[PDB]
């Protein structure tokens, strides 16, 4: 993780920068939700390093970082509902949410998803908990949402002729 | 005593693929999206800001390899530059 002294930055598009809060009194927070076992659909082997890398990255970046794993869409809203209330937000200049699951068109999926047994956290929902209403310590304060999950079944691509 | 605030501001989502389409994740090396995110976060963290950095990683997927996927940025409501001053 590469580092510092560039004051060029505070003299660019400044005061359209986000105000950062001093490093001595920060309680910064970040959440990794990552699912690997599922009741019915293919186990996510390799998801560990996703958790690792991201947790070190985040930590390195100046963040205390919670991991929770193997959740329903339920425990996704309820745990995430909790991340909203954590009073360290008041002394934080930002946050990082990350999810890592299987996924469908509509959303991230949870522990139990099949086509007869559906389990989906909408990307809608992530936003509706973490806003000025439900998470008020975070206004005028950036929040990035990092979703590692499949968006649907199609491979990425179209053919062209050369 | 009672003023108004925007209910939605300061967000940015970053996903692994575009809609309808898939995300790769290699067995012993994690998600190719995760790997790449991390790599770019390290080197560009304060050369650049998060809109920029998230652009860059999108760029690095562009000419399709065998397991193609284009990262997308939904629903950014950042009003200001998120420079991430690593070490302050
Ligand atoms: C979405 O449902 C998940 C991605 C996620 O974890 O977010 N998709 C998959 O797990 C796919 C399976 C997959 O990615 N397979 C990796 C295949 N593979 C191999 C053996 N070597 C590779 C190198 C680079 C990229 C992929 C590679 C789906 C398609 C079942």
PDB file of C-alpha atoms and ligand atoms in Angstrom:
ATOM      1  CA  UNK A   1       0.000   0.000   0.000  1.00  0.00           C
ATOM      2  CA  UNK A   2       1.657   3.155  -1.324  1.00  0.00           C
ATOM      3  CA  UNK A   3       1.641   6.250   0.763  1.00  0.00           C
ATOM      4  CA  UNK A   4       1.836  10.035   1.277  1.00  0.00           C
ATOM      5  CA  UNK A   5       3.186  13.594   0.877  1.00  0.00           C
ATOM      6  CA  UNK A   6       1.276  15.076  -1.885  1.00  0.00           C
ATOM      7  CA  UNK A   7      -0.104  18.450  -0.954  1.00  0.00           C
ATOM      8  CA  UNK A   8      -0.808  18.973  -4.635  1.00  0.00           C
ATOM      9  CA  UNK A   9      -3.998  17.186  -3.683  1.00  0.00           C
ATOM     10  CA  UNK A  10      -5.247  19.682  -1.142  1.00  0.00           C
ATOM     11  CA  UNK A  11      -4.704  22.286  -3.921  1.00  0.00           C
ATOM     12  CA  UNK A  12      -6.682  20.916  -6.799  1.00  0.00           C
ATOM     13  CA  UNK A  13     -10.474  20.513  -6.879  1.00  0.00           C
ATOM     14  CA  UNK A  14     -10.341  21.473  -3.247  1.00  0.00           C
ATOM     15  CA  UNK A  15     -13.264  22.177  -0.950  1.00  0.00           C
ATOM     16  CA  UNK A  16     -14.740  19.845  -3.308  1.00  0.00           C
ATOM     17  CA  UNK A  17     -12.629  17.396  -1.473  1.00  0.00           C
ATOM     18  CA  UNK A  18     -14.128  15.365   1.292  1.00  0.00           C
ATOM     19  CA  UNK A  19     -12.959  16.703   4.659  1.00  0.00           C
ATOM     20  CA  UNK A  20     -10.817  14.035   6.261  1.00  0.00           C
ATOM     21  CA  UNK A  21     -10.576  13.686   9.995  1.00  0.00           C
ATOM     22  CA  UNK A  22      -7.304  13.570  11.878  1.00  0.00           C
ATOM     23  CA  UNK A  23      -5.573  10.301  12.331  1.00  0.00           C
ATOM     24  CA  UNK A  24      -5.251  10.426  16.072  1.00  0.00           C
ATOM     25  CA  UNK A  25      -8.889  10.503  17.094  1.00  0.00           C
ATOM     26  CA  UNK A  26     -10.444   8.360  14.398  1.00  0.00           C
ATOM     27  CA  UNK A  27     -12.652   5.397  14.929  1.00  0.00           C
ATOM     28  CA  UNK A  28     -13.013   4.232  11.370  1.00  0.00           C
ATOM     29  CA  UNK A  29     -15.256   1.307  10.516  1.00  0.00           C
ATOM     30  CA  UNK A  30     -15.775  -1.078   7.605  1.00  0.00           C
ATOM     31  CA  UNK A  31     -17.901  -4.135   6.912  1.00  0.00           C
ATOM     32  CA  UNK A  32     -17.132  -7.297   4.930  1.00  0.00           C
ATOM     33  CA  UNK A  33     -20.029  -9.572   4.323  1.00  0.00           C
ATOM     34  CA  UNK A  34     -18.869 -12.727   2.574  1.00  0.00           C
ATOM     35  CA  UNK A  35     -20.785 -15.930   1.885  1.00  0.00           C
ATOM     36  CA  UNK A  36     -19.125 -19.275   1.024  1.00  0.00           C
ATOM     37  CA  UNK A  37     -21.428 -22.163   2.032  1.00  0.00           C
ATOM     38  CA  UNK A  38     -24.869 -22.339   0.631  1.00  0.00           C
ATOM     39  CA  UNK A  39     -27.622 -24.846   1.319  1.00  0.00           C
ATOM     40  CA  UNK A  40     -28.286 -25.520  -2.304  1.00  0.00           C
ATOM     41  CA  UNK A  41     -25.880 -23.801  -4.706  1.00  0.00           C
ATOM     42  CA  UNK A  42     -22.183 -24.216  -5.550  1.00  0.00           C
ATOM     43  CA  UNK A  43     -19.829 -23.546  -2.677  1.00  0.00           C
ATOM     44  CA  UNK A  44     -17.732 -20.412  -3.299  1.00  0.00           C
ATOM     45  CA  UNK A  45     -14.191 -21.840  -3.177  1.00  0.00           C
ATOM     46  CA  UNK A  46     -11.529 -19.176  -3.193  1.00  0.00           C
ATOM     47  CA  UNK A  47     -13.643 -16.724  -1.263  1.00  0.00           C
ATOM     48  CA  UNK A  48     -11.222 -16.605   1.622  1.00  0.00           C
ATOM     49  CA  UNK A  49      -8.592 -14.518  -0.182  1.00  0.00           C
ATOM     50  CA  UNK A  50     -11.408 -12.138  -1.059  1.00  0.00           C
ATOM     51  CA  UNK A  51     -12.022 -11.723   2.645  1.00  0.00           C
ATOM     52  CA  UNK A  52      -8.340 -11.590   3.531  1.00  0.00           C
ATOM     53  CA  UNK A  53      -7.133  -9.257   0.832  1.00  0.00           C
ATOM     54  CA  UNK A  54     -10.009  -6.923   1.362  1.00  0.00           C
ATOM     55  CA  UNK A  55      -9.718  -6.872   5.142  1.00  0.00           C
ATOM     56  CA  UNK A  56      -5.987  -6.120   4.947  1.00  0.00           C
ATOM     57  CA  UNK A  57      -6.562  -3.534   2.273  1.00  0.00           C
ATOM     58  CA  UNK A  58      -9.215  -1.862   4.353  1.00  0.00           C
ATOM     59  CA  UNK A  59      -7.222  -2.073   7.556  1.00  0.00           C
ATOM     60  CA  UNK A  60      -4.095  -0.731   5.824  1.00  0.00           C
ATOM     61  CA  UNK A  61      -6.285   2.087   4.575  1.00  0.00           C
ATOM     62  CA  UNK A  62      -7.174   3.136   8.097  1.00  0.00           C
ATOM     63  CA  UNK A  63     -10.201   1.101   9.088  1.00  0.00           C
ATOM     64  CA  UNK A  64     -11.297  -1.227  11.801  1.00  0.00           C
ATOM     65  CA  UNK A  65     -12.922  -3.969   9.856  1.00  0.00           C
ATOM     66  CA  UNK A  66     -15.657  -6.437  10.756  1.00  0.00           C
ATOM     67  CA  UNK A  67     -16.106  -9.701   9.025  1.00  0.00           C
ATOM     68  CA  UNK A  68     -19.290 -11.623   8.934  1.00  0.00           C
ATOM     69  CA  UNK A  69     -19.746 -14.729   6.837  1.00  0.00           C
ATOM     70  CA  UNK A  70     -22.446 -17.194   5.711  1.00  0.00           C
ATOM     71  CA  UNK A  71     -25.543 -15.148   6.208  1.00  0.00           C
ATOM     72  CA  UNK A  72     -29.158 -15.328   5.051  1.00  0.00           C
ATOM     73  CA  UNK A  73     -30.632 -12.237   3.434  1.00  0.00           C
ATOM     74  CA  UNK A  74     -32.236 -11.835   6.849  1.00  0.00           C
ATOM     75  CA  UNK A  75     -28.989 -11.678   8.841  1.00  0.00           C
ATOM     76  CA  UNK A  76     -27.759  -9.488   6.062  1.00  0.00           C
ATOM     77  CA  UNK A  77     -30.352  -6.819   6.843  1.00  0.00           C
ATOM     78  CA  UNK A  78     -30.189  -7.361  10.545  1.00  0.00           C
ATOM     79  CA  UNK A  79     -26.357  -7.263  10.840  1.00  0.00           C
ATOM     80  CA  UNK A  80     -26.227  -4.428   8.381  1.00  0.00           C
ATOM     81  CA  UNK A  81     -28.920  -2.676  10.354  1.00  0.00           C
ATOM     82  CA  UNK A  82     -26.454  -2.922  13.241  1.00  0.00           C
ATOM     83  CA  UNK A  83     -23.549  -1.534  11.239  1.00  0.00           C
ATOM     84  CA  UNK A  84     -25.678   1.547  10.829  1.00  0.00           C
ATOM     85  CA  UNK A  85     -25.964   2.186  14.525  1.00  0.00           C
ATOM     86  CA  UNK A  86     -22.353   1.746  15.599  1.00  0.00           C
ATOM     87  CA  UNK A  87     -21.431   4.924  17.465  1.00  0.00           C
ATOM     88  CA  UNK A  88     -17.927   4.976  16.054  1.00  0.00           C
ATOM     89  CA  UNK A  89     -19.533   6.361  12.945  1.00  0.00           C
ATOM     90  CA  UNK A  90     -19.781   9.715  14.698  1.00  0.00           C
ATOM     91  CA  UNK A  91     -16.041   9.974  14.803  1.00  0.00           C
ATOM     92  CA  UNK A  92     -15.542   8.592  11.282  1.00  0.00           C
ATOM     93  CA  UNK A  93     -14.840  10.357   7.989  1.00  0.00           C
ATOM     94  CA  UNK A  94     -16.248   7.558   5.811  1.00  0.00           C
ATOM     95  CA  UNK A  95     -17.088   3.878   5.445  1.00  0.00           C
ATOM     96  CA  UNK A  96     -16.610   0.816   3.252  1.00  0.00           C
ATOM     97  CA  UNK A  97     -19.253  -1.831   2.751  1.00  0.00           C
ATOM     98  CA  UNK A  98     -18.392  -4.923   0.896  1.00  0.00           C
ATOM     99  CA  UNK A  99     -20.453  -7.903  -0.060  1.00  0.00           C
ATOM    100  CA  UNK A 100     -19.192 -11.108  -1.620  1.00  0.00           C
ATOM    101  CA  UNK A 101     -21.731 -13.718  -2.653  1.00  0.00           C
ATOM    102  CA  UNK A 102     -23.422 -15.513  -5.449  1.00  0.00           C
ATOM    103  CA  UNK A 103     -25.880 -13.163  -7.077  1.00  0.00           C
ATOM    104  CA  UNK A 104     -28.824 -12.830  -9.393  1.00  0.00           C
ATOM    105  CA  UNK A 105     -30.243 -10.103 -11.602  1.00  0.00           C
ATOM    106  CA  UNK A 106     -32.008  -8.371  -8.710  1.00  0.00           C
ATOM    107  CA  UNK A 107     -29.552  -8.896  -5.923  1.00  0.00           C
ATOM    108  CA  UNK A 108     -26.894 -10.443  -3.747  1.00  0.00           C
ATOM    109  CA  UNK A 109     -27.991 -13.850  -2.506  1.00  0.00           C
ATOM    110  CA  UNK A 110     -27.822 -15.394   0.937  1.00  0.00           C
ATOM    111  CA  UNK A 111     -27.293 -18.742   2.597  1.00  0.00           C
ATOM    112  CA  UNK A 112     -30.294 -20.627   1.381  1.00  0.00           C
ATOM    113  CA  UNK A 113     -31.025 -19.605  -2.258  1.00  0.00           C
ATOM    114  CA  UNK A 114     -32.326 -21.944  -4.899  1.00  0.00           C
ATOM    115  CA  UNK A 115     -35.013 -21.441  -7.529  1.00  0.00           C
ATOM    116  CA  UNK A 116     -37.585 -22.958  -5.271  1.00  0.00           C
ATOM    117  CA  UNK A 117     -35.959 -21.444  -2.119  1.00  0.00           C
ATOM    118  CA  UNK A 118     -35.147 -17.738  -2.856  1.00  0.00           C
ATOM    119  CA  UNK A 119     -32.822 -15.592  -0.716  1.00  0.00           C
ATOM    120  CA  UNK A 120     -31.921 -12.065  -2.020  1.00  0.00           C
ATOM    121  CA  UNK A 121     -30.525  -8.804  -0.634  1.00  0.00           C
ATOM    122  CA  UNK A 122     -31.369  -6.070  -3.094  1.00  0.00           C
ATOM    123  CA  UNK A 123     -28.748  -3.473  -3.874  1.00  0.00           C
ATOM    124  CA  UNK A 124     -31.675  -1.239  -3.152  1.00  0.00           C
ATOM    125  CA  UNK A 125     -31.705  -2.409   0.416  1.00  0.00           C
ATOM    126  CA  UNK A 126     -28.021  -1.750   1.103  1.00  0.00           C
ATOM    127  CA  UNK A 127     -28.688   1.811   0.213  1.00  0.00           C
ATOM    128  CA  UNK A 128     -31.902   2.171   2.126  1.00  0.00           C
ATOM    129  CA  UNK A 129     -30.301   1.228   5.392  1.00  0.00           C
ATOM    130  CA  UNK A 130     -27.123   3.264   4.976  1.00  0.00           C
ATOM    131  CA  UNK A 131     -28.564   6.677   4.194  1.00  0.00           C
ATOM    132  CA  UNK A 132     -29.183   9.949   6.009  1.00  0.00           C
ATOM    133  CA  UNK A 133     -32.417   8.557   7.423  1.00  0.00           C
ATOM    134  CA  UNK A 134     -31.432   5.217   8.824  1.00  0.00           C
ATOM    135  CA  UNK A 135     -27.735   5.944   9.342  1.00  0.00           C
ATOM    136  CA  UNK A 136     -27.538   9.640  10.190  1.00  0.00           C
ATOM    137  CA  UNK A 137     -23.988   9.780  11.525  1.00  0.00           C
ATOM    138  CA  UNK A 138     -22.916   9.404   7.932  1.00  0.00           C
ATOM    139  CA  UNK A 139     -24.209  12.473   6.082  1.00  0.00           C
ATOM    140  CA  UNK A 140     -21.806  14.590   3.984  1.00  0.00           C
ATOM    141  CA  UNK A 141     -19.537  11.581   4.475  1.00  0.00           C
ATOM    142  CA  UNK A 142     -18.569   9.084   1.800  1.00  0.00           C
ATOM    143  CA  UNK A 143     -19.660   5.459   1.673  1.00  0.00           C
ATOM    144  CA  UNK A 144     -18.489   2.886  -0.867  1.00  0.00           C
ATOM    145  CA  UNK A 145     -20.411  -0.400  -1.377  1.00  0.00           C
ATOM    146  CA  UNK A 146     -18.171  -3.041  -3.152  1.00  0.00           C
ATOM    147  CA  UNK A 147     -20.198  -5.944  -4.436  1.00  0.00           C
ATOM    148  CA  UNK A 148     -18.420  -9.066  -5.486  1.00  0.00           C
ATOM    149  CA  UNK A 149     -21.217 -11.251  -6.844  1.00  0.00           C
ATOM    150  CA  UNK A 150     -22.524 -12.472 -10.164  1.00  0.00           C
ATOM    151  CA  UNK A 151     -25.114 -10.275 -11.817  1.00  0.00           C
ATOM    152  CA  UNK A 152     -26.811 -13.006 -13.842  1.00  0.00           C
ATOM    153  CA  UNK A 153     -25.877 -16.029 -15.948  1.00  0.00           C
ATOM    154  CA  UNK A 154     -24.696 -14.703 -19.296  1.00  0.00           C
ATOM    155  CA  UNK A 155     -20.980 -14.577 -20.062  1.00  0.00           C
ATOM    156  CA  UNK A 156     -19.742 -11.140 -20.699  1.00  0.00           C
ATOM    157  CA  UNK A 157     -19.698 -11.076 -24.423  1.00  0.00           C
ATOM    158  CA  UNK A 158     -20.647 -10.396 -28.036  1.00  0.00           C
ATOM    159  CA  UNK A 159     -18.749 -11.566 -31.138  1.00  0.00           C
ATOM    160  CA  UNK A 160     -17.189  -9.331 -33.765  1.00  0.00           C
ATOM    161  CA  UNK A 161     -15.518  -9.998 -37.145  1.00  0.00           C
ATOM    162  CA  UNK A 162     -11.977  -9.114 -38.158  1.00  0.00           C
TER     163      UNK A 162
ATOM    164  CA  UNK B   1     -34.151  24.398  14.610  1.00  0.00           C
ATOM    165  CA  UNK B   2     -35.422  22.270  11.792  1.00  0.00           C
ATOM    166  CA  UNK B   3     -33.448  22.247   8.576  1.00  0.00           C
ATOM    167  CA  UNK B   4     -33.441  19.999   5.521  1.00  0.00           C
ATOM    168  CA  UNK B   5     -30.955  17.464   4.270  1.00  0.00           C
ATOM    169  CA  UNK B   6     -30.809  15.266   1.208  1.00  0.00           C
ATOM    170  CA  UNK B   7     -31.901  11.750   1.923  1.00  0.00           C
ATOM    171  CA  UNK B   8     -29.485  10.367  -0.627  1.00  0.00           C
ATOM    172  CA  UNK B   9     -25.943  11.607  -0.945  1.00  0.00           C
ATOM    173  CA  UNK B  10     -22.255  10.542  -0.773  1.00  0.00           C
ATOM    174  CA  UNK B  11     -22.708   6.998  -2.052  1.00  0.00           C
ATOM    175  CA  UNK B  12     -20.887   4.912  -4.555  1.00  0.00           C
ATOM    176  CA  UNK B  13     -21.469   1.353  -5.461  1.00  0.00           C
ATOM    177  CA  UNK B  14     -18.860  -0.703  -7.257  1.00  0.00           C
ATOM    178  CA  UNK B  15     -19.835  -4.141  -8.576  1.00  0.00           C
ATOM    179  CA  UNK B  16     -17.895  -6.946 -10.224  1.00  0.00           C
ATOM    180  CA  UNK B  17     -19.808  -7.126 -13.529  1.00  0.00           C
ATOM    181  CA  UNK B  18     -22.376  -5.350 -15.682  1.00  0.00           C
ATOM    182  CA  UNK B  19     -26.066  -6.401 -15.453  1.00  0.00           C
ATOM    183  CA  UNK B  20     -27.048  -9.767 -16.924  1.00  0.00           C
ATOM    184  CA  UNK B  21     -23.431 -10.845 -16.774  1.00  0.00           C
ATOM    185  CA  UNK B  22     -21.115 -12.962 -14.708  1.00  0.00           C
ATOM    186  CA  UNK B  23     -18.297 -12.592 -12.209  1.00  0.00           C
ATOM    187  CA  UNK B  24     -15.231 -14.787 -12.135  1.00  0.00           C
ATOM    188  CA  UNK B  25     -13.520 -16.208  -9.098  1.00  0.00           C
ATOM    189  CA  UNK B  26     -10.559 -18.534  -9.359  1.00  0.00           C
ATOM    190  CA  UNK B  27     -10.183 -21.395  -6.861  1.00  0.00           C
ATOM    191  CA  UNK B  28      -6.748 -20.683  -5.510  1.00  0.00           C
ATOM    192  CA  UNK B  29      -6.534 -17.002  -6.318  1.00  0.00           C
ATOM    193  CA  UNK B  30      -9.813 -15.457  -5.328  1.00  0.00           C
ATOM    194  CA  UNK B  31     -12.080 -13.252  -7.312  1.00  0.00           C
ATOM    195  CA  UNK B  32     -10.427 -11.652 -10.289  1.00  0.00           C
ATOM    196  CA  UNK B  33     -12.471  -8.609  -9.437  1.00  0.00           C
ATOM    197  CA  UNK B  34     -11.248  -8.602  -5.859  1.00  0.00           C
ATOM    198  CA  UNK B  35      -7.574  -9.158  -6.750  1.00  0.00           C
ATOM    199  CA  UNK B  36      -7.638  -6.276  -9.211  1.00  0.00           C
ATOM    200  CA  UNK B  37      -9.493  -3.860  -6.954  1.00  0.00           C
ATOM    201  CA  UNK B  38      -6.938  -4.458  -4.227  1.00  0.00           C
ATOM    202  CA  UNK B  39      -3.974  -4.089  -6.579  1.00  0.00           C
ATOM    203  CA  UNK B  40      -5.275  -0.766  -7.865  1.00  0.00           C
ATOM    204  CA  UNK B  41      -6.207   0.493  -4.459  1.00  0.00           C
ATOM    205  CA  UNK B  42      -2.644   0.088  -3.331  1.00  0.00           C
ATOM    206  CA  UNK B  43      -0.944   1.956  -6.071  1.00  0.00           C
ATOM    207  CA  UNK B  44      -3.391   4.662  -6.810  1.00  0.00           C
ATOM    208  CA  UNK B  45      -4.847   5.418  -3.310  1.00  0.00           C
ATOM    209  CA  UNK B  46      -3.393   8.841  -3.246  1.00  0.00           C
ATOM    210  CA  UNK B  47      -2.080   9.397  -6.506  1.00  0.00           C
ATOM    211  CA  UNK B  48      -5.792   9.558  -7.342  1.00  0.00           C
ATOM    212  CA  UNK B  49      -9.344   9.614  -5.907  1.00  0.00           C
ATOM    213  CA  UNK B  50     -12.013   6.905  -5.749  1.00  0.00           C
ATOM    214  CA  UNK B  51     -13.869   7.860  -8.917  1.00  0.00           C
ATOM    215  CA  UNK B  52     -10.606   7.823 -10.794  1.00  0.00           C
ATOM    216  CA  UNK B  53      -9.309   4.622  -9.141  1.00  0.00           C
ATOM    217  CA  UNK B  54     -12.584   2.888  -9.909  1.00  0.00           C
ATOM    218  CA  UNK B  55     -12.276   4.009 -13.512  1.00  0.00           C
ATOM    219  CA  UNK B  56      -8.785   2.545 -13.784  1.00  0.00           C
ATOM    220  CA  UNK B  57      -9.806  -0.932 -12.697  1.00  0.00           C
ATOM    221  CA  UNK B  58     -12.619  -0.906 -15.228  1.00  0.00           C
ATOM    222  CA  UNK B  59     -10.013  -0.063 -17.853  1.00  0.00           C
ATOM    223  CA  UNK B  60      -7.870  -3.020 -16.867  1.00  0.00           C
ATOM    224  CA  UNK B  61     -10.513  -5.511 -17.914  1.00  0.00           C
ATOM    225  CA  UNK B  62     -11.234  -4.128 -21.291  1.00  0.00           C
ATOM    226  CA  UNK B  63      -9.853  -6.261 -24.099  1.00  0.00           C
ATOM    227  CA  UNK B  64     -11.547  -9.561 -23.279  1.00  0.00           C
ATOM    228  CA  UNK B  65      -9.547 -12.383 -21.885  1.00  0.00           C
ATOM    229  CA  UNK B  66     -11.060 -15.845 -21.822  1.00  0.00           C
ATOM    230  CA  UNK B  67     -12.998 -14.984 -18.691  1.00  0.00           C
ATOM    231  CA  UNK B  68     -14.270 -11.566 -19.385  1.00  0.00           C
ATOM    232  CA  UNK B  69     -16.185  -9.216 -17.092  1.00  0.00           C
ATOM    233  CA  UNK B  70     -16.663  -5.460 -17.022  1.00  0.00           C
ATOM    234  CA  UNK B  71     -16.834  -3.875 -13.539  1.00  0.00           C
ATOM    235  CA  UNK B  72     -19.546  -1.213 -13.130  1.00  0.00           C
ATOM    236  CA  UNK B  73     -20.115   1.770 -10.885  1.00  0.00           C
ATOM    237  CA  UNK B  74     -23.793   2.102 -10.035  1.00  0.00           C
ATOM    238  CA  UNK B  75     -25.425   4.924  -8.183  1.00  0.00           C
ATOM    239  CA  UNK B  76     -22.643   7.259  -7.358  1.00  0.00           C
ATOM    240  CA  UNK B  77     -23.852  10.219  -5.389  1.00  0.00           C
ATOM    241  CA  UNK B  78     -20.434  11.466  -4.375  1.00  0.00           C
ATOM    242  CA  UNK B  79     -20.601  15.208  -4.477  1.00  0.00           C
ATOM    243  CA  UNK B  80     -16.892  15.732  -3.897  1.00  0.00           C
ATOM    244  CA  UNK B  81     -13.592  14.067  -4.666  1.00  0.00           C
ATOM    245  CA  UNK B  82     -12.817  11.166  -2.484  1.00  0.00           C
ATOM    246  CA  UNK B  83      -9.104  11.335  -2.080  1.00  0.00           C
ATOM    247  CA  UNK B  84      -8.035   8.704   0.366  1.00  0.00           C
ATOM    248  CA  UNK B  85      -4.817  10.126   1.941  1.00  0.00           C
ATOM    249  CA  UNK B  86      -3.167   6.885   3.130  1.00  0.00           C
ATOM    250  CA  UNK B  87      -1.344   7.752   6.279  1.00  0.00           C
ATOM    251  CA  UNK B  88      -3.409  10.665   7.547  1.00  0.00           C
TER     252      UNK B  88
HETATM  253  C1  LIG C   1     -21.097 -15.543  -9.097  1.00  0.00           C
HETATM  254  O1  LIG C   1     -22.160 -16.470  -8.946  1.00  0.00           O
HETATM  255  C2  LIG C   1     -19.733 -16.207  -8.882  1.00  0.00           C
HETATM  256  C3  LIG C   1     -18.645 -15.149  -8.636  1.00  0.00           C
HETATM  257  C4  LIG C   1     -18.581 -14.699  -7.176  1.00  0.00           C
HETATM  258  O2  LIG C   1     -18.058 -15.397  -6.343  1.00  0.00           O
HETATM  259  O3  LIG C   1     -18.915 -13.544  -6.939  1.00  0.00           O
HETATM  260  N1  LIG C   1     -19.378 -16.959 -10.083  1.00  0.00           N
HETATM  261  C5  LIG C   1     -18.695 -18.116 -10.064  1.00  0.00           C
HETATM  262  O4  LIG C   1     -18.303 -18.680  -9.040  1.00  0.00           O
HETATM  263  C6  LIG C   1     -18.401 -18.672 -11.468  1.00  0.00           C
HETATM  264  C7  LIG C   1     -17.362 -19.806 -11.381  1.00  0.00           C
HETATM  265  C8  LIG C   1     -15.958 -19.242 -11.583  1.00  0.00           C
HETATM  266  O5  LIG C   1     -15.703 -18.050 -11.469  1.00  0.00           O
HETATM  267  N2  LIG C   1     -15.090 -20.184 -11.989  1.00  0.00           N
HETATM  268  C9  LIG C   1     -13.676 -19.893 -12.131  1.00  0.00           C
HETATM  269  C10 LIG C   1     -13.116 -20.631 -13.352  1.00  0.00           C
HETATM  270  N3  LIG C   1     -11.681 -20.348 -13.572  1.00  0.00           N
HETATM  271  C11 LIG C   1     -10.616 -21.170 -13.560  1.00  0.00           C
HETATM  272  C12 LIG C   1     -10.685 -22.652 -13.245  1.00  0.00           C
HETATM  273  N4  LIG C   1      -9.456 -20.535 -13.784  1.00  0.00           N
HETATM  274  C13 LIG C   1      -9.763 -19.200 -13.946  1.00  0.00           C
HETATM  275  C14 LIG C   1      -8.996 -18.085 -14.142  1.00  0.00           C
HETATM  276  C15 LIG C   1      -9.590 -16.829 -14.228  1.00  0.00           C
HETATM  277  C16 LIG C   1     -10.969 -16.701 -14.091  1.00  0.00           C
HETATM  278  C17 LIG C   1     -11.749 -17.836 -13.893  1.00  0.00           C
HETATM  279  C18 LIG C   1     -11.171 -19.074 -13.791  1.00  0.00           C
HETATM  280  C19 LIG C   1     -19.655 -19.081 -12.280  1.00  0.00           C
HETATM  281  C20 LIG C   1     -19.381 -18.928 -13.789  1.00  0.00           C
HETATM  282  C21 LIG C   1     -20.204 -20.484 -11.952  1.00  0.00           C
END
